[PDB]
Design a protein around this nucleic acid. Structure first.
Lengths: 80, 92, 49, 103, 97, 78, 76, 93, 93
DNA sequence: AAAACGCGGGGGACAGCGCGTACGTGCGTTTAAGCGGTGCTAGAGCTGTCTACGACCAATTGAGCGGCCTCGGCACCGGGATTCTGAT
DNA sequence: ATCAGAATCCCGGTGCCGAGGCCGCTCAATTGGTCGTAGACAGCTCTAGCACCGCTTAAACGCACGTACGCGCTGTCCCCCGCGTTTTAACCG
């Protein structure tokens, strides 16, 4: 299938259980794929812009970290 | 000693809507807006240069900064005319 | 305390420690032998590292 | 005047000053301030366009902070480009919840 | 004739979206900001423009919070707003330190 | 003396916010939330003044305290 | 351990980046950062959504719950 | 060494070097790097202490993402400092 | 090659606060990125403040104000105190 | 001009009670995916040469800022027309 | 289905303050030149993260079943509206 459906219903389930959800409605899953989709569009857009500026043909973890830091969620662990 | 984008907002308005004006307080809002957008774009250009080990904020850094601040329906037209300005400057 | 013992032998005779209080107050800026030699060095000023 | 020679209406020299004294990098390229002036000019023109159209639709020939607020918020995009911004003495868009109506 | 409960409430809503002048009463806000800054520094000093900026950002905060609170009640099939609605709005927003 | 931000004031601010009905306890809780926000902005403002050595908060220092909390204010200088 | 599922996430990321650029070539660390960030976002959002359901007197989250969470966050 | 004479564990000299090379200002005061290194050392010491305490509570000699994230999130102080931050491989409270 | 990281210094602080505990490559990377984030934030605040005061130099009082704004509170006093001890002891020697 | 009290009153909260769609929960399949292992070779990441680019410095001047001064235009009012609203 | 009674709304009248123009001379702009050195460019060595394939097996899919809860409906009774009336704090010279 299309890889947006790759994020499986059990994966959405485990995410919800971690966040404290007791029960998940069948309509939840499509929209979780949607919000995941739009967030990835944003972060990948900034990352690809960073590479294009850098004349680098390879997205880099520093680029991802910088993109996330601008969007407002700094990511620690992949610094360099 | 105050420094502002007064005459420039006036010149743009009188160029594009000649029948309208800009109040003092509307001008204050607009001055803050221009200063804020300038600060955001320039700060992003500086951060891009620091990331890239770059000691110059070139038109390319400003390119990336504008394309990366203005998210959609902007920085297509804005980039096109920005490049137009830089190009015909270099011509002239 | 070793310094104040080397100065004022009779601990019961508080007067010497009392008059010494400014000295130990203002000399706390150094607390190590190497730093003290080095401070004599800063005042030596013999173009030294 | 670099503003004239670059065909802009904003100050090339001034944006060059500000890029200097902001300490944004050790050096500033020749073309960068002209590009930044162009971007600032065009953002200025577009937000002023929305403001002037709001004023005309308000039958009213003057930009006041409410007019700037509508110019910002009514556009689906500038609303969230300035979403963290608060325009002073601009109200809010007249929206009312549909369930919160007499029926 | 006796107006039924709700229509003048809509009327005030429409009036206050049409209007734009500030709405928190300005001298009480002067006193509140003065006594709130007192606890952070004795012999402290304010000017009119600074107090205006505080009052106006304050008004922005409260209108945004009331957007969220109203909308939360509407999601909860609720037309009134309740302290629980405000608390939820804030704690999703993250300002509940 | 918290009552300066009065019941009609909170009421009208809610009506600007599109609220149709307001529970009674909203007024007290709203004043509390207002106090918290005010503490947050005054702390940064007075810090900026202490930086300037002055006593008087400038509108610039207000704007900078507000821009610290990611809520930029426009019109009061820049 | 991580729960958004590795290779599916990588392919999803690949086709998302395909639209923004061609012959674009990720790094393993970049993919890990992307997955971890998306995991954190989604766990936060489900926490918000469950708050929303619990306030609406519901145990099972719903579409309206997640849209409430989003349009109070502000990206929507 | 400036750090060794300072009795702080952080490099005052390299902090000064980066403050110069970071386009932060044309000149940097002598005490600014020192103060910044002191605050960095203090925050690192606080977080590492909390992480070690979490590891002891978990009966583990090894400080892992879950220890660090659990420290930051349990502690209200660091929680409000890094609320809008995410720790890699870090679990939920 | 010479890599820009706060490895040895975080090790030193960790042995000082918990001599038995150790930290691995990944967790050192977490600490390094965290310290870089905090340090970038403080330095950016200091530069912005020097700018808004029209002062073209950076110093311990700049960093005073930056730390006091950034750290939420009840470590603000501690960070200020340890930074101040560092800077007075600097200005002595 | 606004806030503050008070009264009756309508509207809606909150709780209870029922039913049925929807949910979670096994039951094992089929699926795909770590976690190895293959062979690349794009493209780093790094160095070295040399040019145009940019940073400083006088010398020259013309755009901007503050001050000053008019008068359109907006807010304001009363009075007049518009209007959406039950109420019976 | 109907029209009375408040609020909203149209126009235009007069008054005042700020916008927008003008003027001077301040200050930084704009040539013009020089020097140093940052980047573009060229070139090399070597990383590393493709593309896929084993293989085991955890996990996902599909289906079927039972029942806890979503949503609706009804009922009562607390808790606000929406005035009118009476204080009250504030209003700007």
């Amino acid at each position: 299938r299309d890889n947006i459906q790759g994020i499986t219903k059990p994966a959405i389930r485990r995410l919800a259980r971690r966040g404290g959800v007791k029960r998940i409605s069948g309509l939840i899953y499509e929209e979780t794929r949607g919000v995941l989709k739009v967030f990835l569009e944003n972060v990948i857009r900034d990352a690809v812009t960073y590479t294009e500026h850098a004349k680098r043909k390879t997205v880099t973890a520093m680029d991802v970290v910088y993109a996330l830091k601008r969007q407002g969620r700094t990511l620690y662990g992949f610094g360099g | 000693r105050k420094e502002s984008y007064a005459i420039y907002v006036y010149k743009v308005l009188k160029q594009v809507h000649p029948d309208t004006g800009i109040s003092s307080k509307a001008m204050s809002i607009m001055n803050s807006f221009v200063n804020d957008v300038f600060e955001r774009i320039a700060g992003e250009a500086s951060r891009l240069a620091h990331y890239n080990k770059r000691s110059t904020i070139t038109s390319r850094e400003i390119q990336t900064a504008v394309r990366l601040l203005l998210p959609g329906e902007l920085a297509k037209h804005a980039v096109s005319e920005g490049t137009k300005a830089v190009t015909k400057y270099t011509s002239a | 305390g070793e310094i104040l013992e080397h100065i004022c032998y009779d601990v019961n005779d508080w007067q010497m420690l009392e008059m010494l209080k400014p000295c130990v107050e203002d000399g706390f800026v150094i607390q190590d032998r190497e730093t003290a030699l080095d401070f004599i060095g800063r005042r030596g000023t013999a173009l030294g590292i | 005047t670099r503003s004239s020679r670059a065909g802009l209406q904003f100050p090339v020299g001034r944006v060059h000053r500000l890029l200097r004294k902001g300490n944004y990098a050790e050096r500033v390229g020749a073309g960068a301030p002209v590009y930044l002036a162009a971007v600032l000019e065009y953002l200025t023109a577009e937000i002023l366009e929305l403001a002037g159209n709001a004023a005309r639709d308000n039958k009213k020939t003057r930009i006041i902070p409410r007019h700037l607020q509508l110019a910002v918020r009514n556009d689906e995009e500038l609303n969230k480009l300035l979403g963290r911004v608060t325009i002073a003495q601009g109200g809010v868009l007249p929206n009312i919840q549909s369930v919160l109506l007499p029926k | 004739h006796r107006y039924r409960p709700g229509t003048v409430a809509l009327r005030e809503i429409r009036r206050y979206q049409k209007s734009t002048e500030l709405l928190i009463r300005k001298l009480p806000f002067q006193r509140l900001v003065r006594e709130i800054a007192q606890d952070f520094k004795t012999d402290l000093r304010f000017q009119s423009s600074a107090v205006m900026a505080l009052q106006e950002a304050s008004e922005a905060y409260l209108v945004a919070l009331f957007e969220d609170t109203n909308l939360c009640a509407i999601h909860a099939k609720r037309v009134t707003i309740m302290p629980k609605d405000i608390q939820l709005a804030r704690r999703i927003r993250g300002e509940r330190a």
